[model samples]
Target: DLKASSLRALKLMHLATANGDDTDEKVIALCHQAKTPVGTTDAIFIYPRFIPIARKTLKEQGTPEIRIWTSTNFPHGNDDIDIALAETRAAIAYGADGVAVVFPYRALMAGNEQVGFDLVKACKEACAAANVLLSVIIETGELKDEALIRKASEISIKAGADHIVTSTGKVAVGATPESARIMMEVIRDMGVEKTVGFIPAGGVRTAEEAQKYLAIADELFGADWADARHYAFGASSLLASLLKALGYG
Candidate 1:
């Protein structure tokens, strides 16, 4: 067997360690571990500060097949994008495959939505110029309101985000069937499903649990949508669990 579902699971399950306390050694070791296994595709790096080493290690190790990524707008994306901008640039400088940008949706929840939208626009323009892939995190879990979620989705799509992320895992709640579906629904309605990708990050633990979200992609989006490019997961531990389930561990 080609381990079709297992590999697809590997694609969706992007190994991540964006816990804000990442060290150079920690991330480089993760890069090695992700490549030690077969059929894995990408990862989200927390240590944007160590871009060169991580990027170099990923490519030099003959695992250029893996996407060595980094994130910006840590903790919470604010209107002040000075740090996010710098981090985004640095990640690109490090030759990252993709950059997970925390689109500033907090301002929207606080009734200053434009701040967030403008932040996303700035980040989008930066990524466009740099030619680095951008994944926008909407942080819907922090939002106790529905209208805000929809509004954020609409704004981010309009701002030209490459992907829209549901949760950041730092919230009281995380990725859920409902929130992920809502985001997918927005893109599908906008007819931008082809342009904008979707990632249901945070708290995705098991392969079966990860399947609920991936199934959403299959039944609603398309079989191709569940693959690496258009989709992914933010849970670091999910990979080991998925591998064990599929007997790759």
Candidate 2:
């Protein structure tokens, strides 16, 4: 099962954050590198404008299955619903296989839960219409307690998000074991373990660290549950560690 875990580990990995100075050529190069050791990855998370380049490059290279994923409202979860919806619609239109949006945690923190629900529901409607996967990221770093975290997860799942993600890598705290447990427990209790996914982003840098998170998924959802479809980790540096562990340099 070491080989199976290793293979599935890579399959669960996603390379992220090609924003700021990233160019079309850079994105194409990153897409090429994402296929290095195993010719597969969960997705490449990039800016919306670059989706076409990533998608077309992978498609032309005959590995279109490596998904091109983009984020909405990005590291901050405070964008207005209209702005977030535009970001979602545009990403879906540009051929992104999935879109991850930051949950409006500020609204939840301010005691306006309906705003959070409404935004996620609206984005879900758009993504559902396009048949694209919608992931709602709850920046657990900003949440104050376990109850708030649980509420965020509940809102995302009930509003029809395909995944309940932790962190956006912009805060001091990213994904912690405690937070991962809280989110997964909500998914299990909600009985959407088979339909929804869990993604832990930020501060996950090595293969050993990746295993801890995957192990949590194994513990909560069974060992066979942590595959590419149902679980993924958003780490920009984890790809290198995974490749090394699998016998590549």
Candidate 3:
């Protein structure tokens, strides 16, 4: 029944996208439609300039249950800590329910763990007033070894991240099962609660791939803990395949 519920939610999302007109209106309408039909909600990521408009539109739709997640230090994530923190703070002020901050891979790879941790901590503190959920992006491909991945996860959790996410989906390679497993292990090692989770985005384009991720989470985090809160697949293509798999095609 849980699987069927998840599948039906996926179908509503798929149908919304297929039947919509413009990107913004369509996306908001689709999310509202999906939430109404499935009794679940969705989050939308937006650029700084569009935040106000997005908030207004979503509010007008009477779907206040939705969350706005904005990306900071974004795809490249090579900016200075001050700028990243400023951007994150601004995003929250502009109505982002959560902030997805990308770790500075260049600095991390160049052996600057302090910089990464400080930035995340500062951003987390800045979001204190807003109470926005912080999802830290590790961009796993940039790390050279599992040890580094483990360290990054530990640092991110210590730095106050509510979620740990993989690639920006803009990288040459996306997330892998091995990377997900390693990240989850690191999270578990840190002794955090359900507050910590994993999101493997990019190149995950099918229901089967999503299922593999669910399977991995179940394998690593146990079946009882393997739900959307603890593990999620971020993909634009995933809904369609999930729809077909659920016999909605």
Better of 2 and 3 by TM-score: 2
What's the TM-score of each model vs. the native?
0.91, 0.94, 0.84
Worst 10 residues of 3 by lDDT: 12-21
lDDT of each: 0.76, 0.84, 0.69
- RMSD values for the candidates in order, in angstroms, are 2.3, 1.8, 3.9
Which parts of model 1 have CA positions greater than 4 angstroms off?
A: 1-4, 18-20
Clashes of 3: 0
Q: lDDT by residue for model 1 over 70-156, one digit each (tens)?
A: 788865777786777877887787777678878677678778877777777877787889878888888888875678778888998
> Any idea what lDDT model 1 has?
0.76
Model 2 per-residue lDDT at 9: 70
- 2 or 3, greater by lDDT: 2
Query: Highest lDDT, which number?
Result: 2
lDDT per residue as tens, model 2, 1-249: 444555677787777743324588888887887787575877887888998778888888777888877889776887499999998999899888889999999889989898889899999999999989999999998995999999999999999999989988778788988899899999999999999999988787778777778888988888888777789888776777777888888
Clashing residue pairs, candidate 2? none
lDDT of 3 by residue, 1-249 (tens): 435544633522212233212366655555554443334446555565566776676678776656566778887877488899889878887877778899876787888888889988988887766878788888888784888888888888899888888777777677888888888888777777477978777566666666666676677667777554565555555665666666655
